[PDB]
Design a protein around this ligand. Sequence first.
Ligand SMILES: CCCCC/C=C\C/C=C\C/C=C\C/C=C\CCCC(=O)NCCO
Length: 136
Amino acid sequence: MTRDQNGTWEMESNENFEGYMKALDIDFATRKIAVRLTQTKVIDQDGDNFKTKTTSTFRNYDVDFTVGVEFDEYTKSLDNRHVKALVTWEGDVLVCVQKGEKENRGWKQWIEGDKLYLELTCGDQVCRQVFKKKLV
Ligand SMILES: CCCCC/C=C\C/C=C\C/C=C\C/C=C\CCCC(=O)NCCO
């Protein structure tokens, strides 16, 4: 029973964020800033209801969803695309498919220990992020 992802999470690694961004057509100048940043993720979870905020000094991004309920996602200030997003549970892994103009776009997020893992995929590019839980 590791579906509880509540907390504030601080990035410790960000593998192939460059390639993921390039697959989303983010311009070089934006990538130059974005690749350098430590991100923080705040997850406020009540059962299958999630409110998430991802922050950095350069851009912030909020997305709220209920597991199992498809929603309209506009990736404002990121790549600024519209997708149909669906989050499901695969075991205790949170899986999101972002159906739209990019093939094989989605993410997967899960807990191990005091770490949160987030794998983001677009096309043939996978970005692997690891976050450590912040003490309250
Ligand atoms: C918000 C700080 C990062 C700002 C980056 C600025 C410009 C790069 C442009 C496009 C790259 C695309 C997504 C950023 C990666 C990760 C952001 C979170 C993606 C999510 O949906 N996670 C699941 C939340 O439940």
